[PDB]
């Protein structure tokens, strides 16, 4: 406790009542002549000190501190996600005990948790003969952490994994689990630093916090305090000279990552460690967003008349792609406008993404898949491909990623529905080159080879299917008459007709003669046919027979509605075509007068049919989200309800922060 080292490498005096041996060293730093005033031995000691300090980020005494540009670099191969070079590395022959430690961590990372414990027990026996201190102490810590991992893994596999994967997958042999409970039966970690020899207790005291849990408590509380500081300053209009309260957060985060990744410690994959990175990067991006928009009188920009702009570098993308979940990232998506931030080093990030895709292809093209590896890798693989939207991908990288997401990715964690949401999201800031169109067409070819099942139903939680991938093809490139789809359509006959659903949903794409084939083919009798045909715009108007079908549906809905009221339970229903039909009535689409016979059933229907006799207390303000530009224009053109909707929109602009409400109110109603 003699001095105080700030997070920037500066040093200040804390508890010194004698000579400032820091001050003498730092003046020796700049005095070449005095550096020449040492023996060769002492010169070598100073050189070792200098190299260690320059590698440790310390710079100079705070009294002489000027502009400090501290360097950052992460060198652990596990951080860069190089799963093949590490695979080659493990097979190589060990040389020294440090190599054994590094290989133990590498074995831990790749999901081969079994051999990691055995190698650790090997090194713990073989360590001391060389008289090394640190390696043993760290090897026991890694061992206990990996034991916690194994126990939680087996419990979690037994508990929910049986439902998750459908098979009670056993990654660890029973005798191994029986052993590991025996060896660490009474291991209470707190004593580990209190049992080692006194000589070890005087050299490496700094490594004490890694025993108990406090090493993720001390930094977490400091991050909480800093978060309170920046949040308080964010709502005062304040300006911070020099180091803000936020640059300390970036520095602490990067230093912690260096210490916990270079030293090959295994605490990297624990949830509590992810918790720190989450609220660190979230705070940083929030600060950038706040800086992007505010007001200044004259001197506001005169203070720090520039910014980092949070140029979000490659390490930042690696961190966010690793230590987040999709539900987490959407929270930042709502508040900040991540589109407005700039992506740097648009080439390394491609290397990361193609590495992730390649690993997915390797794992799920061969029958082998280390399930333990799947427990860790899938979250990062999801996050990276989600966040890739803002990244200006190249040709080959786009092709490979689009291939990997569509073909090899397991259906369970990304079904046919949300795969549209991801593949479409990659096209907002990019184009759709011909090769990508070939790939997406190949997907439809595979689905053509699939559409013969007897009980498959393409279960989805977004309500869109392989038709919409061709639809996305056609939105960009209109004249892409499908070819092999024509081949599958022509050969099929009426008897086996489960393919009609998919083929008619892909009526957009077929040959003209294939169109004619589908003409004599197929039928339109129930509402699904009507809506589906209108979905492609084939149906341009309604003959009275179609109106009669609509009326029949309405009568059926009435004849249950009455019973449900007698039975008094409620309902709901998901794809409520009644809301649709209400849209049809208002938009001139159907001018029939019998529709009024079904007023009072659904509030959405009532809000459309009868502006005269519709009271406004049952307005659901989420309605206005799901409306079209033209439909919104038409409702805004009405005189009857404009004022009331205006008020109910004013109130929810004033009492709430949903920006889409804001845009809707000003763009259309004003």
């Amino acid at each position: 406790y003699d001095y105080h080292f700030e997070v920037n490498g500066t040093v200040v005096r804390h508890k010194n009542k004698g000579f400032g041996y820091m001050e003498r060293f730092f003046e020796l730093k700049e005095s070449c002549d005095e550096r020449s005033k040492l023996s060769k031995k002492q010169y070598e000691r100073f050189n070792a000190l200098f190299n260690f300090f320059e590698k440790n980020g310390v710079i100079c005494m705070a009294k002489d501190a000027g502009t400090l540009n501290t360097s950052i670099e992460i060198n652990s191969l596990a951080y860069h996600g190089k799963y093949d070079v590490m695979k080659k590395f493990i097979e190589e022959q060990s040389v020294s005990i440090e190599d054994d430690y590094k290989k133990a961590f590498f074995l831990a990372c790749l999901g081969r948790w079994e051999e990691s414990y055995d190698l650790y027990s090997n090194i713990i026996l073989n360590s001391i003969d060389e008289s090394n201190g640190c390696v043993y102490y760290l090897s026991q810590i890694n061992r206990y952490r990996i034991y916690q991992s194994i126990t939680q893994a087996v419990t979690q596999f037994n508990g929910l994994g049986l439902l998750t994967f459908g098979r009670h997958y056993k990654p660890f042999t029973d005798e191994f689990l029986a052993r590991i409970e025996r060896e660490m039966t009474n291991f209470n970690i707190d004593d580990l630093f209190n049992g080692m020899p006194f000589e070890f207790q005087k050299k490496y005291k700094i490594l004490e916090f890694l025993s108990d849990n406090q090493f993720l408590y001390d930094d977490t509380v400091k991050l909480f305090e800093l978060t309170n500081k920046v949040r308080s300053e964010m709502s005062e209009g304040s300006y911070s000279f020099g180091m803000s309260s936020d640059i300390v957060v970036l520095l602490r985060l990067y230093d912690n990552l260096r210490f916990l990744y270079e030293n090959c410690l295994w605490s990297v994959s624990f949830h509590e460690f992810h918790q720190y990175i989450r609220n660190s990067m979230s705070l940083l991006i929030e600060k950038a967003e706040y800086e992007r928009t505010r007001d200044i009188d004259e001197l506001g920009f005169s203070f720090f008349g520039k910014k980092s702009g949070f140029f979000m570098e490659y390490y930042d993308f690696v961190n966010i792609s690793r230590h987040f979940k999709i539900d987490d990232i959407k929270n930042l998506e709502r508040s900040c406008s991540i589109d407005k931030i700039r992506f740097g080093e648009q080439e390394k990030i491609e290397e990361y993404l193609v590495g992730i895709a390649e690993e997915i292809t390797k794992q799920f093209s061969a029958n082998g898949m280390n399930v333990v590896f799947y427990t860790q890798f899938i979250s990062e693989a999801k996050a990276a491909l989600y966040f890739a939207k803002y990244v200006k991908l190249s040709e080959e990288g786009l092709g490979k990623i689009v291939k990997a997401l569509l073909f090899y990715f397991p259906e369970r964690d990304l079904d046919i529905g949300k795969r549209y949401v991801w593949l479409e999201r990659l096209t907002k800031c990019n184009e759709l080159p011909k090769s990508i169109i070939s790939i997406i067409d190949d997907f439809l070819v595979l689905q053509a080879e699939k559409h013969i099942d007897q009980n498959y139903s393409e279960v989805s939680s977004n309500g869109l299917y392989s038709r919409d991938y061709g639809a996305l093809i056609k939105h960009f490139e209109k004249n892409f008459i499908s070819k092999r789809l024509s081949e599958i359509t022509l050969c099929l006959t009426q008897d086996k007709q489960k393919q009609i659903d998919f083929l008619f949903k892909l009526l957009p794409l077929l040959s003209t003669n294939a169109k004619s084939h589908l003409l004599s083919f197929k039928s339109v009798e129930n509402i699904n046919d009507l809506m589906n045909g209108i979905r492609i715009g084939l149906i341009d108007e309604f003959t009275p027979e179609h109106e009669e079908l609509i009326i029949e549906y309405l009568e059926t809905r009435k004849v249950n509605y009455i019973v449900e009221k007698e039975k008094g339970i409620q309902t709901f229903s998901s794809n409520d075509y009644m809301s649709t039909f209400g849209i049809w009535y208002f938009l001139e689409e159907i001018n029939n007068s019998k529709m009024e016979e079904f007023i009072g059933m659904d509030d959405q229907y009532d809000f459309f049919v009868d502006p005269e006799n519709f009271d406004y207390k049952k307005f659901i303000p989420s309605w206005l989200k799901n409306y079209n530009d033209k439909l919104l224009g038409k409702i805004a053109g009405n005189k009857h309800m404009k004022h009331h909707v205006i008020e109910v929109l004013k109130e929810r602009v004033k009492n709430s922060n949903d920006k889409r409400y804001l845009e809707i109110l000003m763009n259309y109603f004003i």
Partner: protein, 151 residues
């Protein structure tokens, strides 16, 4: 006696093709989050569209428990949906008497649990399970509710 006030709940899973019973008696977090939105679609051609109802829609659910159900879990130890039937009650504020029950039904649920909850200290169980509401391409589904208060 001064101030706090809480409640309870009840969860009821079921795997289709039979009445397989798996359930949790409570759901403390029980974070239910409906969600509807839209970003962009449509070719904006063909003049008359004659329709538009696109609303994506999806539901999120959460449960805590340690009762995976005592027998057939061990039976399979050594994909026919996971439909759930939520149930609870509601009371009239004027009288504060238990007069109405509530049942919530979901027809097609798919479990998607983040299989990396390896935490760093021995916890009090609590293996939080999160659920997604799924629908085939047929009709209806998601939400149907039963309500008492026949008094």
């Amino acid at each position: 006696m001064k101030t706090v006030i809480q409640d309870t709940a009840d969860v009821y899973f079921k795997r289709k093709s039979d009445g397989k019973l798996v359930f949790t008696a409570e759901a403390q977090t029980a974070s239910f989050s409906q969600a509807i939105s839209e970003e962009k679609l449509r070719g904006g051609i063909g003049n008359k569209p004659l329709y538009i109802l696109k609303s994506e829609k999806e539901i999120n659910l959460t449960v805590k428990n340690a009762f995976f159900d005592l027998e057939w879990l061990a039976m399979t130890q050594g994909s026919e949906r996971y439909e759930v039937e939520y149930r609870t009650i509601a009371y009239n504020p004027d009288t504060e008497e238990v007069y109405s029950d509530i049942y919530i039904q979901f027809p097609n649920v798919s479990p998607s649990g983040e299989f990396e909850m390896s935490l760093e200290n021995g916890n009090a169980l609590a293996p939080e399970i999160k659920f997604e509401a799924l629908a085939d391409t047929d009709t209806d589904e998601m939400a149907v509710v039963i309500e008492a208060s026949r008094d």
